[PDB]
Amino acid sequence: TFEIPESVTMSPKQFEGYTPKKGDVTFNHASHMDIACQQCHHTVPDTYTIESCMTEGCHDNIKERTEISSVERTFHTTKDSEKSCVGCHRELKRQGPSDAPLACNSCHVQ
Amino acid sequence: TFEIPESVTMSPKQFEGYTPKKGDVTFNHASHMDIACQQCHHTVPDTYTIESCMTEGCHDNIKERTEISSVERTFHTTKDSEKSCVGCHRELKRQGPSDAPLACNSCHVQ
């Protein structure tokens, strides 16, 4: 019943009439499997479900860019090293050479 | 879509014509929420799903008691401190006073 999707295409195309600045992002669970599911899916105890980070009421704000609900801040902030995409990748580099990408065109596929 | 059940009643009544020796076990995720989901649900990478520990092909052997698929060994072995029920509870005690139960009548409800 509960199936985990290996490859997920995260896209801003879901926002009404937003003209995206970057391409879609492909997230693979395989490369992140050693990380506790709840570290990223940090709201599991609040809803007892695992849902999209961009669900209504979560990180779905495409208007503001510096708010907690903002898409840009959420996935690129370097002040959070546990669940921010670039935040953790950035943090790994402080521990030694890391392949985890910071380049915009590594996450954002074209 | 993906909802996590808080209270799960684990029962051996699901085994053909097995006469159970002990009562059903109630497992609550709330008391175990700090533990990585995949530590217990250790076969997630093999099936990419989270299913019952007693699923066919897993720990469903009620005939043998000392085999890996055996129900008795799986949940009570003290040689595994990561996913065995009594194994971890036992291990916690070596770290200091722990309320985590070892008494048969704590897990097995009556």
Ligand code: HEM
């Ligand atoms: C741990 C093995 C783990 C589980 C379990 C898990 C499940 C999961 C599901 C069911 C989805 C789909 C949600 C939906 O219906 O939209 C999902 C999606 C994503 N996950 Fe995950 N996930 C686990 C682990 C991890 C880890 C360790 C991270 C962080 C590196 C993570 C992140 C993500 C992301 C991102 C998605 C896409 C979410 C979106 O907004 O579309 N998962 N996960």
Ligand code: HEM
């Ligand atoms: C999806 C797996 C997901 C990610 C990724 C994610 C990241 C994230 C970050 C980086 C923060 C920190 C922001 C900061 O600058 O400090 C953060 C904070 C909150 N999130 Fe989140 N988040 C993901 C999923 C979800 C979901 C599904 C919701 C909505 C229920 C949501 C909500 C929030 C809230 C609220 C916060 C602030 C409070 C807190 O727990 O720190 N997030 N998220």
Ligand code: HEM
């Ligand atoms: C945020 C949802 C997020 C994204 C998106 C993301 C992407 C990503 C890519 C594209 C790679 C390269 C490999 C691949 O294509 O899968 C990659 C690899 C690693 N990541 Fe990541 N990642 C996201 C989030 C996080 C978080 C929150 C962490 C850390 C807690 C993290 C870690 C890693 C690691 C480790 C790798 C492997 C790098 C390597 O040495 O090969 N990612 N991520």
Ligand code: HEM
């Ligand atoms: C490189 C500095 C970089 C830029 C620039 C960038 C931009 C960007 C924007 C503007 C968005 C919002 C949606 C849009 O396309 O307009 C966005 C969203 C996501 N990003 Fe990004 N991004 C940059 C870098 C990275 C890196 C290195 C990763 C992966 C670690 C990454 C991930 C994400 C994710 C996840 C999202 C949300 C889903 C989406 O809208 O595509 N970005 N990024």
Ligand code: HEM
């Ligand atoms: C981490 C927050 C986490 C998730 C996610 C999770 C999910 C989950 C589901 C969906 C079930 C139902 C499976 C089914 O359909 O039968 C389930 C059931 C049990 N879980 Fe769990 N679980 C998470 C965390 C943990 C942890 C940390 C443990 C170990 C202490 C654990 C164990 C169990 C057990 C036992 C069950 C009942 C399984 C059965 O055989 O009936 N879960 N979990």
Ligand code: HEM
């Ligand atoms: C359900 C969350 C679940 C539990 C609990 C569990 C425990 C468990 C233990 C204690 C062991 C160690 C046995 C020993 O004495 O060394 C163990 C080993 C295996 N398991 Fe398991 N297991 C749970 C779930 C599942 C599921 C859903 C399956 C079937 C796909 C399964 C299978 C196995 C197998 C095979 C092993 C041996 C190989 C290994 O990974 O160590 N388990 N399990």
Ligand code: HEM
């Ligand atoms: C194996 C599937 C398993 C069961 C069953 C189980 C039950 C259980 C009970 C009945 C309690 C008491 C509280 C309650 O009713 O929920 C309890 C509490 C703790 N457990 Fe446990 N537990 C199972 C598995 C595991 C595993 C694998 C670990 C360790 C990795 C673990 C840990 C804990 C902890 C910690 C507690 C809290 C004790 C406290 O100080 O209150 N359990 N468990």
Ligand code: HEM
């Ligand atoms: C105390 C030493 C103790 C006994 C005895 C005991 C017995 C027992 C049996 C015989 C089974 C198999 C099914 C049956 O009832 O015949 C079984 C299964 C489970 N047990 Fe147990 N058990 C004892 C202790 C404990 C403790 C302290 C816990 C919780 C940490 C626990 C847990 C479980 C679980 C889970 C199962 C599987 C589901 C089920 O069949 O009930 N047991 N136990």
